[PDB]
Short mmCIF file of all heavy atoms in Angstrom, two decimals:
data_model
loop_
_atom_site.label_atom_id
_atom_site.label_comp_id
_atom_site.label_asym_id
_atom_site.label_seq_id
_atom_site.Cartn_x
_atom_site.Cartn_y
_atom_site.Cartn_z
N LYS L 200 -44.34 26.91 -78.90
CA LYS L 200 -45.71 26.43 -79.08
C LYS L 200 -46.41 27.37 -80.17
O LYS L 200 -46.16 28.52 -80.23
CB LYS L 200 -46.48 26.54 -77.80
CG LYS L 200 -47.86 25.84 -77.96
CD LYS L 200 -48.47 25.25 -76.68
CE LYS L 200 -49.94 24.90 -76.81
NZ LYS L 200 -50.82 25.40 -75.84
N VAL L 201 -47.19 26.67 -80.98
CA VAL L 201 -47.96 27.30 -82.10
C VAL L 201 -49.33 27.23 -81.83
O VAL L 201 -49.99 26.22 -81.68
CB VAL L 201 -47.65 26.52 -83.42
CG1 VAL L 201 -48.28 27.33 -84.61
CG2 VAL L 201 -46.21 26.25 -83.63
N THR L 202 -50.06 28.46 -81.84
CA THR L 202 -51.47 28.56 -81.64
C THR L 202 -52.03 29.62 -82.62
O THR L 202 -51.31 30.30 -83.29
CB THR L 202 -51.90 29.03 -80.14
OG1 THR L 202 -51.30 30.30 -79.93
CG2 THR L 202 -51.44 28.08 -79.11
N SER L 203 -53.37 29.59 -82.74
CA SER L 203 -54.10 30.51 -83.54
C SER L 203 -55.56 30.55 -83.29
O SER L 203 -56.15 29.54 -83.07
CB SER L 203 -53.97 30.20 -85.00
OG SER L 203 -54.71 31.08 -85.81
N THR L 204 -56.11 31.80 -83.14
CA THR L 204 -57.59 31.94 -82.80
C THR L 204 -58.42 31.98 -84.10
O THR L 204 -59.66 31.95 -84.07
CB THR L 204 -57.84 33.12 -82.01
OG1 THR L 204 -57.37 34.35 -82.75
CG2 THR L 204 -57.14 33.11 -80.66
N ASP L 205 -57.66 32.07 -85.25
CA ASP L 205 -58.41 32.35 -86.60
C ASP L 205 -57.90 31.57 -87.75
O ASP L 205 -58.33 31.79 -88.90
CB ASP L 205 -58.49 33.86 -86.86
CG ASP L 205 -57.05 34.47 -87.00
OD1 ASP L 205 -56.07 33.85 -87.31
OD2 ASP L 205 -56.93 35.72 -86.68
N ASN L 206 -56.85 30.72 -87.64
CA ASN L 206 -56.20 30.06 -88.73
C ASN L 206 -55.68 31.01 -89.78
O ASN L 206 -55.51 30.63 -90.98
CB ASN L 206 -57.18 29.02 -89.32
CG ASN L 206 -56.38 27.85 -89.98
OD1 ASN L 206 -55.53 27.19 -89.38
ND2 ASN L 206 -56.80 27.56 -91.19
N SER L 207 -55.31 32.19 -89.34
CA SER L 207 -54.71 33.20 -90.28
C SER L 207 -53.47 33.86 -89.68
O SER L 207 -52.47 34.10 -90.34
CB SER L 207 -55.83 34.26 -90.70
OG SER L 207 -55.14 35.26 -91.43
N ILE L 208 -53.59 34.36 -88.42
CA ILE L 208 -52.43 34.83 -87.68
C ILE L 208 -51.99 33.72 -86.75
O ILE L 208 -52.79 33.27 -86.00
CB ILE L 208 -52.76 36.11 -86.99
CG1 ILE L 208 -53.08 37.20 -87.91
CG2 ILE L 208 -51.65 36.47 -85.96
CD1 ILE L 208 -53.52 38.52 -87.19
N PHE L 209 -50.78 33.28 -86.80
CA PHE L 209 -50.29 32.31 -85.94
C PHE L 209 -49.32 32.76 -84.92
O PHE L 209 -48.34 33.46 -85.22
CB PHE L 209 -49.64 31.15 -86.78
CG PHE L 209 -50.62 30.45 -87.72
CD1 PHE L 209 -50.87 31.04 -88.94
CD2 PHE L 209 -51.39 29.37 -87.29
CE1 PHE L 209 -51.83 30.50 -89.76
CE2 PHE L 209 -52.40 28.90 -88.12
CZ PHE L 209 -52.57 29.44 -89.45
N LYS L 210 -49.56 32.43 -83.62
CA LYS L 210 -48.78 32.90 -82.47
C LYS L 210 -47.70 31.90 -82.24
O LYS L 210 -47.99 30.71 -82.16
CB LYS L 210 -49.66 33.00 -81.25
CG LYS L 210 -49.40 34.21 -80.29
CD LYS L 210 -49.51 33.86 -78.81
CE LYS L 210 -50.73 34.30 -78.19
NZ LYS L 210 -50.83 33.90 -76.79
N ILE L 211 -46.46 32.29 -82.11
CA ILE L 211 -45.41 31.44 -81.66
C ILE L 211 -44.77 32.00 -80.38
O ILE L 211 -44.55 33.21 -80.23
CB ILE L 211 -44.28 31.19 -82.71
CG1 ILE L 211 -43.76 32.53 -83.22
CG2 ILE L 211 -44.81 30.36 -83.82
CD1 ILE L 211 -42.51 32.39 -84.14
N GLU L 212 -44.67 31.06 -79.38
CA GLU L 212 -44.26 31.47 -78.04
C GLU L 212 -43.43 30.29 -77.35
O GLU L 212 -43.82 29.17 -77.44
CB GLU L 212 -45.41 31.82 -77.10
CG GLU L 212 -45.90 33.26 -77.28
CD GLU L 212 -46.63 33.75 -76.11
OE1 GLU L 212 -47.41 33.00 -75.55
OE2 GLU L 212 -46.48 34.99 -75.84
N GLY L 213 -42.39 30.75 -76.64
CA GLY L 213 -41.77 29.84 -75.76
C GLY L 213 -40.63 30.42 -74.94
O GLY L 213 -40.15 31.45 -75.19
N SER L 214 -40.26 29.64 -73.92
CA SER L 214 -39.25 30.07 -73.08
C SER L 214 -37.89 29.64 -73.77
O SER L 214 -37.91 28.67 -74.56
CB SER L 214 -39.38 29.44 -71.79
OG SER L 214 -39.18 28.02 -71.86
N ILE L 215 -36.83 30.40 -73.50
CA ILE L 215 -35.53 30.07 -74.07
C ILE L 215 -34.59 29.64 -73.03
O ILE L 215 -34.42 30.37 -72.04
CB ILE L 215 -34.95 31.33 -74.72
CG1 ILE L 215 -35.81 31.83 -75.92
CG2 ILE L 215 -33.53 31.02 -75.26
CD1 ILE L 215 -35.42 33.17 -76.38
N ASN L 216 -33.95 28.47 -73.17
CA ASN L 216 -33.04 27.94 -72.17
C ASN L 216 -32.10 27.04 -72.88
O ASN L 216 -32.30 25.87 -72.93
CB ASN L 216 -33.89 27.20 -71.12
CG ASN L 216 -33.30 27.37 -69.73
OD1 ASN L 216 -32.24 26.76 -69.42
ND2 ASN L 216 -33.99 28.13 -68.86
N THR L 217 -30.98 27.59 -73.35
CA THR L 217 -30.10 26.97 -74.23
C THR L 217 -28.73 27.65 -74.22
O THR L 217 -28.42 28.34 -73.11
CB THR L 217 -30.66 26.91 -75.71
OG1 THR L 217 -29.85 25.99 -76.49
CG2 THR L 217 -30.69 28.29 -76.29
N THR L 218 -27.91 27.39 -75.11
CA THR L 218 -26.53 27.98 -75.26
C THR L 218 -26.39 28.38 -76.75
O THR L 218 -26.90 27.69 -77.65
CB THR L 218 -25.43 27.02 -74.74
OG1 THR L 218 -25.56 25.78 -75.53
CG2 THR L 218 -25.55 26.64 -73.36
N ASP L 219 -25.67 29.42 -76.98
CA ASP L 219 -25.39 29.84 -78.42
C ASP L 219 -24.26 29.12 -79.01
O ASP L 219 -23.72 28.26 -78.32
CB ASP L 219 -25.38 31.35 -78.55
CG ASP L 219 -24.10 31.92 -78.08
OD1 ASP L 219 -23.13 31.21 -77.59
OD2 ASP L 219 -24.03 33.15 -78.13
N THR L 220 -23.92 29.40 -80.26
CA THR L 220 -22.86 28.70 -80.90
C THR L 220 -21.42 28.96 -80.39
O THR L 220 -20.50 28.25 -80.80
CB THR L 220 -22.85 28.77 -82.45
OG1 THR L 220 -23.01 30.17 -82.81
CG2 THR L 220 -24.11 28.05 -83.09
N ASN L 221 -21.26 29.95 -79.53
CA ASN L 221 -20.06 30.05 -78.75
C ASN L 221 -20.09 29.49 -77.29
O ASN L 221 -19.24 29.71 -76.50
CB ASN L 221 -19.57 31.53 -78.60
CG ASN L 221 -19.73 32.28 -79.85
OD1 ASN L 221 -20.34 33.41 -79.83
ND2 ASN L 221 -19.12 31.86 -80.89
N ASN L 222 -21.26 28.81 -77.02
CA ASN L 222 -21.41 28.20 -75.72
C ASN L 222 -21.82 29.17 -74.62
O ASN L 222 -21.71 28.73 -73.43
CB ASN L 222 -20.14 27.36 -75.25
CG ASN L 222 -20.56 25.95 -74.93
OD1 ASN L 222 -21.39 25.36 -75.60
ND2 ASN L 222 -19.79 25.45 -73.97
N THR L 223 -22.24 30.41 -75.00
CA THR L 223 -22.74 31.30 -74.01
C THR L 223 -24.16 30.93 -73.62
O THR L 223 -24.97 30.67 -74.44
CB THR L 223 -22.83 32.70 -74.59
OG1 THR L 223 -21.54 33.04 -75.23
CG2 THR L 223 -23.08 33.78 -73.56
N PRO L 224 -24.45 30.84 -72.27
CA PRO L 224 -25.79 30.51 -71.97
C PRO L 224 -26.81 31.53 -72.46
O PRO L 224 -26.53 32.76 -72.43
CB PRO L 224 -25.84 30.36 -70.44
CG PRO L 224 -24.48 30.06 -70.13
CD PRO L 224 -23.59 30.90 -71.18
N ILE L 225 -28.06 31.20 -72.90
CA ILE L 225 -29.04 32.08 -73.28
C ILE L 225 -30.37 31.69 -72.55
O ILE L 225 -30.84 30.57 -72.79
CB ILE L 225 -29.35 32.05 -74.89
CG1 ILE L 225 -28.00 32.21 -75.64
CG2 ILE L 225 -30.35 33.05 -75.27
CD1 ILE L 225 -27.39 33.61 -75.38
N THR L 226 -30.82 32.60 -71.73
CA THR L 226 -32.09 32.35 -71.05
C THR L 226 -33.12 33.50 -71.27
O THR L 226 -32.76 34.70 -71.32
CB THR L 226 -31.78 32.42 -69.48
OG1 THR L 226 -30.76 31.53 -69.22
CG2 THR L 226 -32.97 31.94 -68.65
N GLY L 227 -34.34 33.14 -71.45
CA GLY L 227 -35.40 34.16 -71.59
C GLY L 227 -36.64 33.64 -72.27
O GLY L 227 -37.07 32.52 -72.07
N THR L 228 -37.21 34.46 -73.18
CA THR L 228 -38.49 34.22 -73.80
C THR L 228 -38.46 34.74 -75.16
O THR L 228 -37.77 35.61 -75.55
CB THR L 228 -39.66 34.80 -72.93
OG1 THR L 228 -39.55 36.24 -72.85
CG2 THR L 228 -39.75 34.21 -71.48
N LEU L 229 -39.48 34.18 -75.99
CA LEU L 229 -39.61 34.80 -77.34
C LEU L 229 -41.13 34.79 -77.51
O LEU L 229 -41.96 33.90 -77.06
CB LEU L 229 -38.95 34.03 -78.32
CG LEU L 229 -39.36 32.69 -78.84
CD1 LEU L 229 -40.44 32.79 -79.90
CD2 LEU L 229 -38.18 31.97 -79.38
N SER L 230 -41.57 35.68 -78.43
CA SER L 230 -42.92 35.85 -78.72
C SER L 230 -43.06 36.45 -80.11
O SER L 230 -42.35 37.39 -80.38
CB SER L 230 -43.55 36.77 -77.70
OG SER L 230 -45.01 36.50 -77.67
N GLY L 231 -43.84 35.83 -80.98
CA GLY L 231 -43.98 36.30 -82.32
C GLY L 231 -45.29 35.87 -83.05
O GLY L 231 -46.09 35.12 -82.53
N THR L 232 -45.35 36.33 -84.35
CA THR L 232 -46.40 35.90 -85.16
C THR L 232 -45.98 35.53 -86.57
O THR L 232 -44.91 36.07 -86.99
CB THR L 232 -47.47 37.07 -85.25
OG1 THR L 232 -46.76 38.30 -85.56
CG2 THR L 232 -48.23 37.27 -83.95
N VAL L 233 -46.72 34.65 -87.18
CA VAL L 233 -46.54 34.41 -88.64
C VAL L 233 -47.89 34.66 -89.33
O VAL L 233 -48.84 34.31 -88.80
CB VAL L 233 -46.06 32.98 -88.86
CG1 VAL L 233 -46.00 32.75 -90.43
CG2 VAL L 233 -44.74 32.64 -88.16
N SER L 234 -47.85 35.37 -90.44
CA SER L 234 -49.02 35.50 -91.23
C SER L 234 -48.62 35.78 -92.66
O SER L 234 -47.90 36.71 -93.06
CB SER L 234 -49.89 36.64 -90.70
OG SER L 234 -51.08 36.73 -91.44
N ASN L 235 -49.27 35.02 -93.62
CA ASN L 235 -49.03 35.13 -95.15
C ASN L 235 -47.53 35.31 -95.38
O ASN L 235 -47.06 36.33 -95.93
CB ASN L 235 -49.83 36.35 -95.66
CG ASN L 235 -51.33 36.15 -95.41
OD1 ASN L 235 -51.98 37.05 -94.99
ND2 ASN L 235 -51.88 34.92 -95.66
N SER L 236 -46.72 34.39 -94.94
CA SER L 236 -45.34 34.32 -95.16
C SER L 236 -44.41 35.34 -94.36
O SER L 236 -43.23 35.34 -94.55
CB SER L 236 -44.89 34.52 -96.70
OG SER L 236 -45.71 33.56 -97.38
N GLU L 237 -45.02 36.23 -93.54
CA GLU L 237 -44.21 37.23 -92.79
C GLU L 237 -44.18 36.83 -91.33
O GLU L 237 -45.19 36.40 -90.70
CB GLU L 237 -44.82 38.57 -92.93
CG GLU L 237 -43.85 39.67 -92.46
CD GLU L 237 -44.57 41.06 -92.11
OE1 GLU L 237 -45.61 41.39 -92.79
OE2 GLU L 237 -44.02 41.80 -91.27
N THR L 238 -43.01 36.99 -90.72
CA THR L 238 -42.93 36.76 -89.29
C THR L 238 -42.35 37.99 -88.63
O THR L 238 -41.62 38.82 -89.17
CB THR L 238 -42.04 35.48 -88.90
OG1 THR L 238 -42.25 35.21 -87.63
CG2 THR L 238 -40.57 35.71 -89.18
N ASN L 239 -42.80 38.20 -87.34
CA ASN L 239 -42.27 39.26 -86.49
C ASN L 239 -42.07 38.63 -85.18
O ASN L 239 -43.01 37.97 -84.63
CB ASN L 239 -43.30 40.37 -86.38
CG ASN L 239 -43.49 41.11 -87.65
OD1 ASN L 239 -42.86 42.15 -87.87
ND2 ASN L 239 -44.41 40.62 -88.49
N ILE L 240 -40.91 38.61 -84.59
CA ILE L 240 -40.52 37.85 -83.36
C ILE L 240 -39.68 38.86 -82.48
O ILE L 240 -38.84 39.40 -82.98
CB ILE L 240 -39.74 36.60 -83.70
CG1 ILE L 240 -40.44 35.72 -84.71
CG2 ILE L 240 -39.53 35.79 -82.42
CD1 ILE L 240 -39.65 34.62 -85.25
N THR L 241 -40.15 38.84 -81.23
CA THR L 241 -39.32 39.52 -80.25
C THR L 241 -38.69 38.54 -79.33
O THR L 241 -39.35 37.68 -78.80
CB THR L 241 -40.18 40.43 -79.37
OG1 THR L 241 -40.85 41.41 -80.29
CG2 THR L 241 -39.46 41.25 -78.33
N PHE L 242 -37.39 38.51 -79.24
CA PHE L 242 -36.62 37.73 -78.28
C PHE L 242 -36.13 38.51 -77.16
O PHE L 242 -35.60 39.58 -77.40
CB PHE L 242 -35.42 37.03 -78.93
CG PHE L 242 -35.69 36.31 -80.18
CD1 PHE L 242 -35.73 37.00 -81.39
CD2 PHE L 242 -35.67 34.95 -80.23
CE1 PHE L 242 -35.99 36.28 -82.60
CE2 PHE L 242 -35.75 34.20 -81.43
CZ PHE L 242 -35.99 34.84 -82.56
N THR L 243 -36.42 38.10 -75.93
CA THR L 243 -35.95 38.83 -74.73
C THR L 243 -35.15 37.86 -73.99
O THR L 243 -35.66 36.80 -73.45
CB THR L 243 -37.10 39.24 -73.84
OG1 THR L 243 -37.98 40.06 -74.63
CG2 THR L 243 -36.63 40.09 -72.64
N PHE L 244 -33.77 38.11 -73.91
CA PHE L 244 -32.95 37.01 -73.31
C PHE L 244 -31.76 37.70 -72.53
O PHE L 244 -31.47 38.83 -72.80
CB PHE L 244 -32.43 36.07 -74.37
CG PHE L 244 -31.70 36.70 -75.38
CD1 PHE L 244 -30.34 36.71 -75.29
CD2 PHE L 244 -32.28 37.32 -76.51
CE1 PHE L 244 -29.53 37.25 -76.34
CE2 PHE L 244 -31.47 37.90 -77.43
CZ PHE L 244 -30.15 37.87 -77.29
N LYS L 245 -31.12 36.86 -71.72
CA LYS L 245 -30.03 37.18 -70.92
C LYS L 245 -28.90 36.32 -71.30
O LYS L 245 -29.10 35.05 -71.21
CB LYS L 245 -30.49 37.14 -69.53
CG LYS L 245 -29.53 36.63 -68.38
CD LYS L 245 -30.18 36.31 -67.13
CE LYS L 245 -29.17 36.29 -65.93
NZ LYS L 245 -29.61 35.43 -64.80
N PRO L 246 -27.78 36.88 -71.83
CA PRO L 246 -26.60 36.05 -72.09
C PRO L 246 -25.72 35.96 -70.82
O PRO L 246 -25.47 36.91 -70.19
CB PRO L 246 -25.83 36.83 -73.14
CG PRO L 246 -26.27 38.21 -72.89
CD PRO L 246 -27.65 38.23 -72.34
N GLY L 247 -25.36 34.74 -70.51
CA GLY L 247 -24.49 34.48 -69.31
C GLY L 247 -25.14 34.96 -68.12
O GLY L 247 -26.34 34.62 -67.97
#
């Protein structure tokens, strides 16, 4: 999901529930920001 309170810093957030390219399950969450071409994202997940 993409949100912003100021149309300058954009928040990206969502739950993670998928599998990676070796078929290992990946569960968790991510949280980050985009601003003026720069992103910073923290992914917190559990493999298998």
